[PDB]
Amino acid sequence: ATAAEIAALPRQKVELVDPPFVHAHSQVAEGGPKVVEFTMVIEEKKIVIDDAGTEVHAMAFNGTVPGPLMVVHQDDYLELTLINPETNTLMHNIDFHAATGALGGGGLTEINPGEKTILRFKATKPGVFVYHCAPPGMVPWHVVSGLNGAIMVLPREGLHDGKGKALTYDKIYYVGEQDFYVPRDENGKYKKYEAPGDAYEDTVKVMRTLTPTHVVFNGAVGALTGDKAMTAAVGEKVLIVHSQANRDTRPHLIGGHGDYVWATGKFNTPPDVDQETWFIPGGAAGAAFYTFQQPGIYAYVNHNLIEACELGAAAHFKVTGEWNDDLMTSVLAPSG
Amino acid sequence: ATAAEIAALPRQKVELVDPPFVHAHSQVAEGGPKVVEFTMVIEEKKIVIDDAGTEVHAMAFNGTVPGPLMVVHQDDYLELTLINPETNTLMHNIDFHAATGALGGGGLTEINPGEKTILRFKATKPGVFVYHCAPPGMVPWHVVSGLNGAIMVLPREGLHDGKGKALTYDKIYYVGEQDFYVPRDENGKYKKYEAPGDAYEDTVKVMRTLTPTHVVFNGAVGALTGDKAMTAAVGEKVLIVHSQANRDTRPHLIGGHGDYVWATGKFNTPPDVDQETWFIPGGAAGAAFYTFQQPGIYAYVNHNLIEACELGAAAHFKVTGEWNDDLMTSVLAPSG
Amino acid sequence: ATAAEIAALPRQKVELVDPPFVHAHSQVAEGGPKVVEFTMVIEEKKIVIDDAGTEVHAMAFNGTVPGPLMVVHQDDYLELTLINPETNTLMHNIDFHAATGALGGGGLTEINPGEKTILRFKATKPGVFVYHCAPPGMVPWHVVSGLNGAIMVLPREGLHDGKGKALTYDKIYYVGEQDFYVPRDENGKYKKYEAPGDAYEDTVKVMRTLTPTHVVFNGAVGALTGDKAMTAAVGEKVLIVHSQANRDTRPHLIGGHGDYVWATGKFNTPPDVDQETWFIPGGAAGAAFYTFQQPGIYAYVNHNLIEACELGAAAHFKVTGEWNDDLMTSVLAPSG
Ligand SMILES: [Cu+2]
Ligand SMILES: [Cu+2]
Ligand SMILES: [Cu+2]
Ligand SMILES: [Cu+2]
Ligand SMILES: [Cu+2]
Ligand SMILES: [Cu+2]
């Protein structure tokens, strides 16, 4: 398409929402290609990532870790306004793995504090894709400080199985997983720093161990548990998008399955089926479709259970509905 | 099916055998759905895991690491009697990744020492699947102390390739891989503890390094080597089921291939073919089908060769038969 | 085929070239099966792997890390002459993951300094495959000292997509990724050793951490950057073969995609498509096909960005041609 042709396309104008929720959208595209407009502001801010008050100097798109999920359809244009407030201290940019050219957009979006930029790309490939900040020379430090999220480029006809039959979800959640590398003093106690730059040298040394101190969903241990558990009902169809911008993960729904899993995240690659535990390499997003069949609590984890239970990578679903004794029953309850 | 309908199905009544062997079964289902009955008892016991006499306080289904492979067919019911002897000190339960509901069955099977329980689930999905103990708050500690194994849910028509043609094995082996985290004193020597609870605090600290001290097959360095090597003949078709309940692995048959590999473990996901080294994420089982073409020794390894050769993850096959010079020949033997 | 039948086949006689370049070959086979002849000599030599002058006692096929890519077609015979100079101090051999029998050929090729050997195998399976040295009892030490590479066994009809349509590349590159484990003194400074044997004990201890000090492409930090960047033009079709003999990797072309990716490396396993970041397990090769659509610099990385940016796993492409504003445009350049 020419400049005039793109300028003539309909616009929309989307208000991004905080994960794990996803902004309103339609599974099947409404009409022809659009220029879909998104705005994000980068926040440099202290966050608490565990129950012991561990503080990190986050970088965070729209103030959240992960940044929000942007949803468009194949062959739409995604037009992002990115704002770096003058109160920030660092240059930031954005690399969309969905995009083609200029280091994912990183080369065209380097904004110092007090600057903004608008990037447009054609979403030519359907799938879920990571995005992250990527300032030359300080790439992993921004990413593992929280500056990453994902987008979903839906097929224009929505999702399908391997034989071309429709898969339509009732709800969608976006789980971003973050590996954090928090320095410790000689006594083994997590360190606090007055300014983010004070933390840099110490942080790189921990990063070089390739051993995170915390691996969390939605930015903190227990962020998707308790009152903040995800929810569903028996019979409900749920898409769970999962991303990890820097490090491998292996999602597992404890008590369920991934009925269909695009483990590569790419919708033209047929989904795996009946999955127990799927695998998403660092630098990618994946997505799993599941129909709940049993009510109760479910845990959704990185199935390195040390990472899940000791380091923070565990979420919950609370599911309403009627128990199915055919699928599972206690024939004899625990008894002496 | 209703309660009366399930109660009316034929029963069987399987005697589990120690890995890497697998209990008698039929590849193609014999008749309609059955309730297949299994019993396991959990043993808390000291085991030796290497050649230097390193001792671990195991937890072990039927006294082995891994626990035994249970084989049923799709849409059978698996009915497990699980017994926790009064001489044990800890509560245990079981999560079947093949099952749907109540945290894989974990929520319905919490048995203290001196208790038993019977769980029944419908095996709705064909594949190989991990099972493991999962007591709330001490999940990875039980799993990496040895309390895991796998099941196989065969399609009712047995295994097939990607074009629907039968794949029938002559023999099957189950290789369970276990990551152990053994504490060391200030001198670097592995520690022994009088009681398992004495080892807990020290063990968690090693687990949090995400760096195992030992990665072993069938519960010990060299457990599947020497007199205990697996065996085959040229022309024989072998299924090798492999599981890892907590950590990634990358199996490789040195001198062979995975002719067909269900790397996800799930039989409705078509197998990869002609594999050199396949990948199984922590929290999953996978399976590889191979027809031996050459006699001699083979090594079967986790192809992180540090894990294989330094940490224990190596097994052998001894294969009988006639050498094939077409496939491989020494044109000039090593010579000055 | 019989001995006389193989002896009667046409020969060729290939001169191996240094990575990332690949020796001349034809995508579609020219005529019937051939015996394709390759010669490599193993060099034990000091190399510098980073910008700070870090020295390793390499072992290196034809003096390079990785060793060169050998290209044959399915059902050709690969006949390798392997030479271990008398100035070397260690026995070496070779395991071809493409081969069937005798530990990949390792059992038939053990050559002491001053010896040579000639091994022939039938390349029965199409794909890219790792090869590496594998001396009993010192396997990972030779591999992670640099003694590995890959081969490509092309289908006789060349490459195809999932629907059988031809995929013909304009150029091919071979990226070998190497994990190095370099000892440090108490002050944290990398150690130099007079003889390779002096480094052994210290090296094993670092290897057992499973934490590499360096993860590099083509044998050194920045080896495929600057003047040594790979190159392409807009519209050009490029195959990128990637191998890792010991450890997982997750390749990503920053600013592009893997249009078709044989992530398992095996051509009879249909390629994934539209990939952002693919995954190659340790002990395997994979291959990605991409048509460049935008000019400029691209980074090609292991997308654990700590491994990429801190440990060395990053390469560049410099791509000529006309910018495509449809695919991507800066609507508003960075501005206050
Ligand atoms: Cu940034
Ligand atoms: Cu990226
Ligand atoms: Cu237990
Ligand atoms: Cu589990
Ligand atoms: Cu060697
Ligand atoms: Cu190998």
UniProtKB/Swiss-Prot annotation, chains A, B, C:
Subcellular location: Periplasm
Record EC number: 1.7.2.1
Coiled coil: none
CDD domains: CuRO_1_CuNIR
Pathway: Nitrogen metabolism; nitrate reduction (denitrification); dinitrogen from nitrate: step 2/4
PTM notes: Predicted to be exported by the Tat system. The position of the signal peptide cleavage has been experimentally proven.
Subunit structure: Homotrimer.
Note on domains (UniProt): The type I copper site in NIR plays a crucial role for electron transfer from pseudoazurin to the type II copper site of NIR, which comprises the catalytic center of NIR for the reduction of nitrite.
Family named by the database record: Belongs to the multicopper oxidase family.
Protein name: Copper-containing nitrite reductase
The organism's taxonomic lineage, starting at the top: Bacteria, Pseudomonadati, Pseudomonadota, Betaproteobacteria, Burkholderiales
